Amino acid sequence: ANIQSFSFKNFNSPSFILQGDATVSSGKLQLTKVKENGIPTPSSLGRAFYSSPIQIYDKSTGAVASWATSFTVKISAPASFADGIAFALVPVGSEPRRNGGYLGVFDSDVYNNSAQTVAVEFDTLSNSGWDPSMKHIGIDVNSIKSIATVSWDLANGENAEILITYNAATSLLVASLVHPSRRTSYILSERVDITNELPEYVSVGFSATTGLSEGYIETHDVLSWSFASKLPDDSTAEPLDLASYLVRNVL
Amino acid sequence: ANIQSFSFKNFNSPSFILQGDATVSSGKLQLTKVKENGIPTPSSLGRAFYSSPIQIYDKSTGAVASWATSFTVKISAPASFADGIAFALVPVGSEPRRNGGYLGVFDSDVYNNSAQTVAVEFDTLSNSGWDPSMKHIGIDVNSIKSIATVSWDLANGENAEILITYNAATSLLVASLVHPSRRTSYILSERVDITNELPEYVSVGFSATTGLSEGYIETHDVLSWSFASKLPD
Amino acid sequence: ANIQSFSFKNFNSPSFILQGDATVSSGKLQLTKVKENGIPTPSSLGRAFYSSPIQIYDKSTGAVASWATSFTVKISAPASFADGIAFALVPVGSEPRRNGGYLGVFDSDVYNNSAQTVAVEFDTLSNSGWDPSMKHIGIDVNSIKSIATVSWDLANGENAEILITYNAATSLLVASLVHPSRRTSYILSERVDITNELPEYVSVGFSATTGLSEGYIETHDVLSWSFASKLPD
Amino acid sequence: ANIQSFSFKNFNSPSFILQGDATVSSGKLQLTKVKENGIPTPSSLGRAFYSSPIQIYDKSTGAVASWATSFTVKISAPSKASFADGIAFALVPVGSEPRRNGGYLGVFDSDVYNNSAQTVAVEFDTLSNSGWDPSMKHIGIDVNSIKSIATVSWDLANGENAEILITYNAATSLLVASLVHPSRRTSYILSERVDITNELPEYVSVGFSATTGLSEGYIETHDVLSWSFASKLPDDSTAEPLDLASYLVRNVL
Ligand SMILES: Nc1ncnc2[nH]cnc12
Ligand SMILES: Nc1ncnc2[nH]cnc12
Ligand SMILES: Nc1ncnc2[nH]cnc12
Ligand SMILES: Nc1ncnc2[nH]cnc12
Ligand SMILES: [Ca+2]
Ligand SMILES: [Ca+2]
Ligand SMILES: [Ca+2]
Ligand SMILES: [Ca+2]
Ligand SMILES: [Mn+2]
Ligand SMILES: [Mn+2]
Ligand SMILES: [Mn+2]
Ligand SMILES: [Mn+2]
């Protein structure tokens, strides 16, 4: 089995690939532009990935990896919320895509297998063309139109503790968010045939955009991030030990 | 920091403390009685804990542990569902408590700090005296009347993958359940001041009971279990 | 796969099985008796094991566990060194054995499979009947006469950081010691067919004895201990 | 605390930075050139590092990382030839380009201490160079010079697996290296104090470097069959060694 994992409580540019307005300051990862006075900027786009590629599966052996990631984000608006942040698995060379409601990871709301991108979004602005009525968490598979969503009551300026996992045995992708301050929690799950939607190797990280209008803005700060992946030697899949993963990585 | 952790995909009596009708068979942990033909039995009560005590906090240093546990259960009814299964943190010497709707871990629905027990229940039968309308997941703190619950649609005979965690920094206890077969998931969270509700050392494990009537029965099988704890200095 | 692991930087009696003069004080594990003034005592014997049994192998599946342990000991003599400390894998019910040069884990220097005990010793006193000329580290398999040893220059009163591992793939048991203060290190390795020398379940821990004479004494303090085991399917 | 770790039982180019003749084939990492017929080549040099930099310490907080690595190598020399030159596990500056070949193992330029080299390595030297080497084949700790600050004799078992384990404990500042040839049940260990914050930069790349002899008959192969690495950087000055019991079973065993 092959394993790769990391856990950061403090950020520094060397281990990350930064794109767009993504910057590291005061130990935290700021995905979108922010004026010196502290207020967000419109039309911003930022991405950040771990500098080492992760192998999601192996065509020759037929093995599929199980993985998990957890991070803490803080979204603040002075002003209306827009556009959101996504955790994404993109092709290794990958360059940013459309901004605004496309969150920098997609080009359209029509399924396009060739986009080879899967993401879990925390959408703060409903786009009439493809979005559910309110702020939501969604699973995007090669299109900005989530294959599943759940309502989310964003607590402005308060920490959000997210946990995403993929179990190769059940092919189930599960995402959950918790706002400790309000004792509120959300969860969502859907089956995803990963070997068909992504390449063998991918970069893992975040993508975030602000609104395209003067008053549709918010900040996207990642305060901590952990990731762990396990690729077996044969077809037989083996979920990860989360009890052990969080305490040794998150708690 | 002190750490203790384990992960079982196969069960064997040696590493566990079995109470009541709790038994290990064919590699799985069966908390409640089951007739040879495979059908559950009424008035059953079973408990099982890891043989090594876990230190939840330290009075002298003021440190509080963060921990997590995950397991897979399978609940089946031929009949009506009753009574449920709970993941519990009990005092080390601890003997079973009332059966039926008390799930073997409590004696009343009135808060009693001296019970020194905290549990996360998967309640399959609504007891008029203290339960919400339907089947639910709840956090119990020294009383069978959950301080918080969430509706749960139990998928009969299908695996349930549960994950419970306690974060000492936020004092937040979070429980989640997933039925992979139906792609359904539930989550619940509530702040718990653990150092006030439990002793420094506890045993961790499960407790399960069946209904007290002829037709209120179900099975409680644990197929795998992991636990991890970290106590700072 | 089944996994069990723990790591202590601070000790407390609840999670351990203490035998003989083994005691926990000021957060450390003291295996042998010590007078209030701080000086060791002769004819002492102490043992301590983790309260949860560990499965070394499985007869039905034919799987053998790989494991590792690491700890820090401090041995001090006011006086001549005796008798030593051992890391041992004993049968679960196991009661102490002969003291003195037998380190509390064996009864003779003649191989006796029925002893079902394997130990890695840090022998501070050469017993003419079975010991190499000086202080040594040795691997004992069902007898106090090590099947392999290595010379060891004990640094009185200075910490010793030990690491022992068992690789089921190669059947190799490897032990190593490091005295950071003197920048000295020792290593030893030998093949051991574990499934033949021990039972499926064992208790893991330490055993230590002092000399049987008035001036053959030393202290045996364990300052930290970690253990990890993995049993495949 | 910041943590980074990985463990490979099978190799693939994407996650590694390959330099020189370093190549990945049949799942293993081949550091030095090898003719199709299987025999090694002279004057070869190969290096390979994990694609993500590792932070060894932090100047602002004064924290120093504790880390460990373990790997399995197989060194082989054809009957008619002689062993040369060796393989090293190294911690080099991030941009770092290969250095002198032959007995310099691709990581150093001289046997005179040069702090500006900012490189620390643990070598498995198969050829004694009169100018700075002990009499026989050895394991040594090199700190900014090819002349080890400490060595230990090593009886290389030709063609047999070598299981190496290297660790650095920030609390004691002790670097410890060990090798085991399971086939022969032989083992070696070496240890020495190293003030890492003074010999290396805050960020480094971790990996291997290997060279073959500069003569027609001084050649050997350098194959890495598996590799694990784990690092932990605290938030303050206070150092905390790693849990090796847990590290090997979860990574090596
Ligand atoms: N990703 C996830 N988030 C929350 N609970 C889970 N249970 C299993 N996977 C989970
Ligand atoms: N116990 C838990 N279950 C699901 N998601 C979580 N996120 C944090 N703790 C969690
Ligand atoms: N037990 C052990 N001690 C020291 N080095 C080792 N390398 C492999 N096993 C070892
Ligand atoms: N690097 C190392 N190799 C072998 N034994 C060790 N004990 C502590 N560190 C070690
Ligand atoms: Ca949107
Ligand atoms: Ca009930
Ligand atoms: Ca002796
Ligand atoms: Ca040389
Ligand atoms: Mn959306
Ligand atoms: Mn209830
Ligand atoms: Mn001896
Ligand atoms: Mn040399």
Spatial CB neighbours of A211, under 8 Å, sequence gap ≥ 6? A42, A43, A80, A82, A83, A100, A125, A217
User: Which single residue is written with the structure tokens 């037929």?
Assistant: A62
Distance CA A191, CA A202 (A): 19
Cβ of A53 within 8 Å of Cβ of D7? The answer is no
User: What DSSP element (H or E) covers B140?
Assistant: strand B136-141
Report the b/e string of D113-150 with b at 16+ CB within 10 A: eeeebebbbbbbbbbbeeeebeeebbbbbbbbbbbbeb
Distance CA A249, CA D230 (A): 13
Spatial CB neighbours of A78, under 8 Å, sequence gap ≥ 6? A39, A40, A217
Nearest-Cα residue of chain B relative to residue C92: B14
What is the residue type of B131?
D
Supply the Cα-derived Rg of chain A in whole angstroms: 17
The resolution in angstroms reads 2.7
Token output for C106: 């064996």
Distance CA B113, CA B143 (A): 9
Which atom belonging to ligand 1 lies closest to the Cα atom of A68? 1
- Identify all chain B residues contacting C3, using CB atoms and an 8 Å cutoff: 5-7
DSSP string for residues in A130-197: T--SSSEEEEEESSSS-SEEEE----TTSEEEEEEEEETTTTEEEEEEEETTTTEEEEEEEE--HHHH
What is the residue type of B126?
S
Spatial CB neighbours of D163, under 8 Å, sequence gap ≥ 6? D70, D71, D72, D179, D180, D181, D182
| Distance from the C63 Cα atom to the nearest Cα atom in chain B, whole angstroms | 13
Residue D129's DSSP bridge partners are none
With the most atoms of ligand 4 within 8 angstroms of its CB, the residue from C71, C173, C185 to mutate is: C185
- Identify all chain C residues contacting B12, using CB atoms and an 8 Å cutoff: 55
With the most atoms of ligand 4 within 8 angstroms of its CB, the residue from C69, C163, C189 to mutate is: C163
User: D82 near D218, Cβ under 8 Å?
Assistant: yes
How much helix, strand and coil, in percent to the nearest 5, is found in chain B? 5, 50, 45
User: B209 near B104, Cβ under 8 Å?
Assistant: yes
User: Which single residue is written with the structure tokens 């009424």?
Assistant: B42
User: B100 near B212, Cβ under 8 Å?
Assistant: yes
User: B186 C-alpha vs ligand 1 centroid, how far in Å?
Assistant: 10
User: D57 near D202, Cβ under 8 Å?
Assistant: yes
Distance CA B81, CA B76 (A): 8
Distance CA B121, CA B133 (A): 15
DSSP assignment, residue C40?
Answer: B
* Distance, CA of D214 to chain centre: 21
Task: Kindly tell me the burial class for residue B219, based on how many C-beta atoms sit within 10 Å of its own C-beta (0-12, 13-18, 19 or more).
Answer: buried
Whose Cα sits closest to atom 7 in ligand 1? B163
DSSP assignment, residue D32?
Answer: S
User: A51 near A209, Cβ under 8 Å?
Assistant: no
Q: Phi/psi at A10 (nearest 5 deg)? A: -145, 135
- Identify all chain A residues contacting D2, using CB atoms and an 8 Å cutoff: 6-10
Cβ of D189 within 8 Å of Cβ of C187? The answer is yes
Candidate from C67, C68, C189 with C-beta closest to D185: C189
The residue among D230, D206, D232 whose CA lies nearest residue D58 is D232
Candidate from A188, A190, A243 with C-beta closest to B68: A243
User: B230 near A251, Cβ under 8 Å?
Assistant: yes
A178 ligand 2 Cβ < 6 A:
yes
Distance CA A243, CA B10 (A): 17
| Three-state secondary structure readout of B86-98 | EEEEEECCCCCCC
Distance CA B62, CA B59 (A): 5
The residue among B230, C103, C192, B21 whose CA lies nearest residue A245 is B230
For residue A137, the ligand closest to its alpha carbon is 9
Whose Cα sits closest to atom 4 in ligand 2? B176
Compute the C-alpha angle A156/A157/A160, nearest 5°.
90
- The total of structural domains in chain C comes to 1
Pocket, ligand 4, Cβ cutoff 6 A: C 161, 163, 176, 178; D 165-167, 176-178, 189
Distance CA C110, CA C130 (A): 10
What is the residue type of D191?
S
User: D164 near D177, Cβ under 8 Å?
Assistant: yes
Whose Cα sits closest to atom 10 in ligand 3? C174
The residue among D55, D49, D118 whose CA lies nearest residue D88 is D49
Q: What is the CB neighbour count within 10 angstroms for residue C122?
A: 24
Q: Are strands D120-125 and D138-143 parallel, antiparallel or unpaired?
A: antiparallel
Q: What is the CB neighbour count within 10 angstroms for residue D160?
A: 14
Whose Cα sits closest to atom 5 in ligand 4? C176
What is the residue type of D199?
E
Q: How many pairs of residues across A and D have Cβ atoms under 8 Å apart?
A: 63
Which atom belonging to ligand 4 lies closest to the Cα atom of C178? 7
Report the b/e string of C186-205 with b at 16+ CB within 10 A: bbbbbebebbebbbbbbbbb
Candidate from C5, C185, C190 with C-beta closest to D246: C5
User: C82 near C124, Cβ under 8 Å?
Assistant: yes
Q: Phi/psi at A186 (nearest 5 deg)? A: -135, 150
Spatial CB neighbours of A219, under 8 Å, sequence gap ≥ 6? A30, A32, A34, A40, A74, A75, A76, A77
Distance CA C139, CA C146 (A): 5
- Taking phi over 0 as left and psi of -120 to 50 as alpha, with beta for the rest, B106 belongs to beta
Residue C207's DSSP bridge partners are C47, C86
Token output for A16: 């990350």
The range of the structural domain enclosing residue C182 comes to 1-233
Last residue before each break in chain C (C–N > 2.5 Å): 78
Cβ of D176 within 8 Å of Cβ of C186? The answer is no
User: B116 near B199, Cβ under 8 Å?
Assistant: yes
Q: What is the CB neighbour count within 10 angstroms for residue B35?
A: 8
For residue A145, the ligand closest to its alpha carbon is 9
Angstrom distances, CA of residue D117 to CA of A67, B48, D91: 39, 60, 11
Nearest-Cα residue of chain A relative to residue B163: A243
Spatial CB neighbours of B139, under 8 Å, sequence gap ≥ 6? B118, B119, B120, B121, B146, B147, B148, B149, B173, B175, B188, B190, B192
CATH number of the domain enclosing A123: 2.60.120.200
Q: What is the CB neighbour count within 10 angstroms for residue C149?
A: 20
User: D125 C-alpha vs ligand 8 centroid, how far in Å?
Assistant: 5
Cβ of C68 within 8 Å of Cβ of D249? The answer is yes
Candidates B2, B8, B64, B70: best to mutate against A (most CBs of A within 10 A) is B70
How much helix, strand and coil, in percent to the nearest 5, is found in chain C? 5, 50, 45
Distance CA D224, CA C37 (A): 55
Residue positions counted in chain A: 251
Cβ of A6 within 8 Å of Cβ of D5? The answer is yes
Q: Look at residue D109 and give its three-state secondary structure.
A: coil
DSSP assignment, residue B115?
Answer: G
Distance CA D39, CA D44 (A): 12
Token output for C2: 């089944």
Residue B162's DSSP bridge partners are B71, B177
Distance CA C206, CA C86 (A): 6
* Distance, CA of B93 to chain centre: 17
Residue A208's DSSP bridge partners are A46, A85
What is the residue type of C107?
D
The residue among B68, B231, B179 whose CA lies nearest residue A242 is B68
Nearest-Cα residue of chain A relative to residue B7: A241
Spatial CB neighbours of B100, under 8 Å, sequence gap ≥ 6? B43, B82, B83, B209, B211, B212
Neighbours of ion ligand 8 (CB under 5 A): D 103, 125, 127, 129, 133
Residues from B in contact with A at Cβ < 8 Å: 3, 5, 7, 66-70, 163, 165, 167-170, 172, 174, 176, 178, 180, 183-191, 226-230
The residue among D125, D139, D113 whose CA lies nearest residue D210 is D125
- Identify all chain B residues contacting C60, using CB atoms and an 8 Å cutoff: none
DSSP assignment, residue D196?
Answer: H
